[PDB]
C-alpha cells in the first residue's frame, strides 16, 4: 500500500479536467469549461501483486497564471505532469512558465526534481523535440483528450518511472 500525489498544470481551457476525468471517471471529450477552483480525483492502480498504489490527481486551475503560485500546492507533492494545447505557441510558452515556476518552487528528499511529463493534448513532434532534449524532462508523449488514444500508456510509463525512484 502506497500513496502518491500528482499535480496537473497547464494553461486555461486546454482540457485540464478532461485528462483526469478520462483517467479516473472514464469520460472523454465532453463539453469544455473553465475550472473554478482546485479539484481532486482518486486513481487506483494494481502495479504489482500485493502492492497496490493510490494516486491523487490535483488539476490546478490555470486561470490564476499571473498570480503567485503558492508553495502549498507543491508542498509534499510527489509527481507532476504538464499538459499543453498543441494548437497554440502561447500554450507552449505557458508550459515553459509553469516548468520554470515548478523548478523554482519544488524540493525532494533526495533533492532531484520530481519527474515531469510533457503531454501534448488534443492531437509537429520535431519542433517539440528540441525542448524535449533541452528541458531535461523525464519523457514526452502526445495524446488526444477526445479519443484518449495515449493517456493510459503515458500515465503507466510515468508511474513506472516514479516507482523506479
Amino acid at each position: 500500500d502506497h500513496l502518491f500525489k500528482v499535480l496537473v498544470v497547464g494553461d486555461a481551457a486546454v482540457g485540464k479536467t478532461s485528462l483526469v476525468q478520462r483517467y479516473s471517471q472514464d469520460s472523454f471529450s465532453k463539453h469544455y469549461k473553465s475550472t473554478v477552483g482546485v479539484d481532486f480525483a482518486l486513481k487506483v492502480l494494481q502495479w504489482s501483486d500485493y502492492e497496490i498504489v493510490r494516486l491523487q490527481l490535483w488539476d490546478i486551475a490555470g486561470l490564476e497564471r499571473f498570480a503567485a503560485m503558492t508553495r502549498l500546492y507543491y508542498r509534499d507533492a510527489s509527481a507532476c505532469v504538464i499538459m499543453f494545447d498543441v494548437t497554440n505557441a502561447t500554450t507552449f510558452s505557458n508550459s515553459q512558465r509553469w516548468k520554470q515556476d515548478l523548478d523554482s518552487k519544488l524540493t525532494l528528499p533526495n533533492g532531484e526534481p520530481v519527474p515531469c511529463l510533457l503531454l501534448a493534448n488534443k492531437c509537429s513532434r520535431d519542433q517539440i523535440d528540441r525542448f524535449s532534449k533541452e528541458n531535461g524532462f523525464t519523457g514526452w508523449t502526445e495524446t488526444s483528450v477526445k479519443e484518449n488514444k495515449n493517456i493510459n500508456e503515458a500515465m503507466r510509463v510515468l508511474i513506472e518511472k516514479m516507482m523506479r525512484n
Binding site: 500500500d1 500513496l3 473554478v36 477552483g37 482546485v38 479539484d39 481532486f40 480525483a41 482518486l42 497496490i52 493510490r54 491523487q56 503558492t70 502549498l72 500546492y73 508542498r75 509534499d76
Partner: protein
C-alpha cells in the same frame, strides 16, 4: 507639546521599557493630564503601548482608573474623532487581556454599548476602527454572554463588518470565532450571507491557518445549529462549494492539528446533515488520505478523535471492498491502541469499526485473519472492560464482539482473553437497559465453553440468565435469545439445570 514629543519618541522602541522603569510615575502623569479632548488624543493613548507590558494587577488598577477617564473623554471628543476613538478602543483591548477584568467591563454593560455605538457611527466605512472593535468583540466572549438584545446588536454589527471588509485577516479571525460562539449561543436570510462570508474567508485566505480554522469552525457551528440548509452547500449553482475548500484547507495545512480538527468536524457535520455528500468524498479519495493525516498526527488525542468521527460519519450506510478493509481497519486499530485512556477516541473508533466491519471467500478470510492478528479482540475487550461507564461504548463493544465471534478463529483467542467475565460483568452493571441485555444474552451462548461451566460450576451464569429473563418477560427477542443460550449451555453440561 510634551505629549506629542513623548508620543513621537515612543515610536523609536526600546525606550518604553526605560520609561516604565522610571520614578516619576508617567502612568500617573498621563492620568493627571486629562477636558482638553486634544489631550488624551495628544497623550497618544500610548497607555495601550504601555499596556503591552504593565503586569496584570498593576493593569487592573490601571483598568479602574482608565475605564473611568477614557470612557468619558473618549465618548465626547472621539465621537467626533477617528484617532481618539481608535486609540481608546485599542487601549481597552490591551486593558481587557486579563480574564478577571471582563466582569468589571460588563459591570453595567458600558463596554458593550460603547463598542456597539462605535461600530454603528464612528466607523461606517473605516477599517482599523472596525478591526479593533471586532477584536474587542472576540476578546469579550465568555460564559457571561447572555446579553440577548446586545447579542443581536453585536451579531448584526460583526456580520455587517465581515460583508463590508472581507479582504483583511484582522477581522476574519476574531469575527468568525466570536460569530461561531455567539451563533451557538443564540440559535436556541441570515444563513445565505453567513455562508457567503465563510466561503469568501476560505477562498481568499488559503495561506493563513488561523483564518481557515476560524471560518470552517464558524461554518461547522452554524450548520450544527441550523440543519435546514444542508442542501444549500454543493457544486451545483446557487450553492457555495465549501466542501472542496474545506478539504483543500485541511490538506495544505496538514502540519497544523487545529485546522484539521475544525475542518474534520465541519465536514463531519456536513456529511451527517445530507448523505448525498457521502460516496463523493470517497470518490475524491479522502478516507485513506485522512488516515495518513492521523498517522502523521498521533501524539494528540483530539486529532485522532476528530478523524475517527470523520470515518464514522463517512462510511455510514455504505459497503466497501476487502482492499478498503485491509487499508482502513489496521490504522483505526493502531489509533485506538495508542490512545487507550481517551473515552471519545475509543467510542468513535469502536463506532467506526462496527459500522465498517460488516476467490472472494479466500481473500476475505485473509482479511479476517490479518484483522485478528492486529490484536483487535484484546483492544476492544480492554476498551469495554476498563471503562465501565458511558453505556454507548458498552453497546458498541458488545456489537463488535458479536460481529467478531462468527469469525473462523475467534473462539480460541476470545476464550483466552477472558471475554466471558467481561460480558457477565457488563450484564450485571446494566440490568435495566434492553440492547445490552439482548446482545449479551445472544453472545453468552456463542462464547460459552466447557471450561466456563467446568465441574458443574456455573452459578453466576444461571443467576444472570434467570434475572434477565424475568425482568424482561414480555420482550419476545430477549426471551428467544435467552432460551437459545440456555439450551446451548444445557447441551454442554446437564448439571446446570439443577442450578
Amino acid at each position: 507639546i510634551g505629549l506629542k514629543t513623548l508620543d513621537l519618541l515612543l515610536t523609536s522602541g526600546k525606550i518604553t521599557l526605560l520609561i516604565l522603569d522610571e520614578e516619576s510615575d508617567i502612568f500617573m502623569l498621563i492620568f493627571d493630564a486629562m477636558a482638553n479632548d486634544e489631550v488624551q488624543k495628544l497623550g497618544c493613548k500610548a497607555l495601550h503601548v504601555l499596556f503591552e507590558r504593565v503586569s496584570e494587577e498593576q493593569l487592573t488598577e490601571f483598568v479602574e482608573n482608565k475605564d473611568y477617564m477614557i470612557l468619558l473623554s473618549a465618548l465626547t471628543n472621539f465621537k467626533d474623532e477617528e484617532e481618539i476613538v481608535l486609540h481608546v478602543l485599542h487601549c481597552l483591548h490591551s486593558l481587557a487581556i486579563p480574564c478577571n477584568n471582563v466582569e468589571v467591563l460588563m459591570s453595567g454593560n458600558v463596554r458593550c454599548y460603547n463598542i456597539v455605538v462605535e461600530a454603528m457611527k464612528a466607523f461606517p466605512m473605516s477599517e482599523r476602527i472596525q478591526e479593533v472593535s471586532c477584536c474587542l468583540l472576540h476578546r469579550l466572549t465568555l460564559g457571561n454572554f447572555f446579553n440577548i438584545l446586545v447579542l443581536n446588536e453585536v451579531h448584526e454589527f460583526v456580520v455587517k463588518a465581515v460583508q463590508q471588509y472581507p479582504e483583511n485577516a484582522a477581522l476574519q479571525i476574531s469575527a468568525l470565532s466570536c460569530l461561531a460562539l455567539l451563533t451557538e449561543t443564540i440559535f436556541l436570510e441570515d444563513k445565505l450571507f453567513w455562508l457567503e462570508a465563510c466561503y469568501k474567508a476560505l477562498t481568499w485566505h488559503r495561506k493563513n491557518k488561523h483564518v481557515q480554522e476560524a471560518a470552517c469552525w464558524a461554518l461547522n457551528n452554524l450548520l450544527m445549529y441550523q440543519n435546514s440548509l444542508h442542501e444549500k452547500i454543493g457544486d451545483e449553482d446557487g450553492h457555495f462549494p465549501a466542501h472542496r475548500e474545506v478539504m483543500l484547507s485541511m490538506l495544505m495545512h496538514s502540519s497544523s492539528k487545529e485546522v484539521f480538527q475544525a475542518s474534520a468536524n465541519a465536514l463531519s457535520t456536513l456529511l451527517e446533515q445530507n448523505v448525498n455528500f457521502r460516496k463523493i468524498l470517497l470518490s475524491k479519495g479522502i478516507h485513506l488520505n485522512v488516515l495518513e493525516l492521523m498517522q502523521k498526527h498521533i501524539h494528540s488525542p483530539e486529532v485522532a478523535e476528530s478523524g475517527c468521527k470523520m470515518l464514522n460519519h463517512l462510511f455510514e450506510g455504505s459497503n466497501t471492498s476487502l482492499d478498503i478493509m485491509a487499508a482502513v481497519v489496521p490504522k483505526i486499530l493502531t489509533v485506538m491502541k495508542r490512545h487507550e485512556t481517551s473515552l471519545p477516541v475509543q467510542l468513535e473508533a469502536l463506532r467506526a469499526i462496527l459500522h465498517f466491519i460488516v476467490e472472494f471467500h479466500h481473500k476475505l478470510n485473509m482479511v479476517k485473519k490479518q484483522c485478528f492478528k492486529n490484536d483487535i479482540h484484546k483492544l476492544v475487550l480492554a476498551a469495554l472492560n476498563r471503562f465501565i461507564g458511558n453505556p454507548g461504548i458498552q453497546k458498541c463493544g458488545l456489537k463488535v464482539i458479536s460481529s467478531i465471534v462468527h469469525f473462523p478463529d475467534a473462539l480460541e483467542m476470545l476464550s483466552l482473553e477472558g471475554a466471558m467475565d467481561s460480558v457477565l460483568h457488563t450484564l450485571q452493571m446494566y440490568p435495566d437497559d434492553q440492547e445490552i441485555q439482548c446482545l449479551g444474552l445472544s453472545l453468552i451462548g456463542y462464547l460459552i465453553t466447557k471450561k466456563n461451566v467446568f465441574i458443574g460450576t456455573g452459578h453466576l451464569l444461571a443467576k444472570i440468565l434467570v434475572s434477565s429473563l424475568y425482568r424482561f418477560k414480555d420482550v419476545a427477542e430477549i426471551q428467544t435469545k435467552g432460551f437459545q443460550t440456555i439450551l446451548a449451555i444445557l447441551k454442554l453440561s446437564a448439571s446446570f439445570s439443577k442450578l
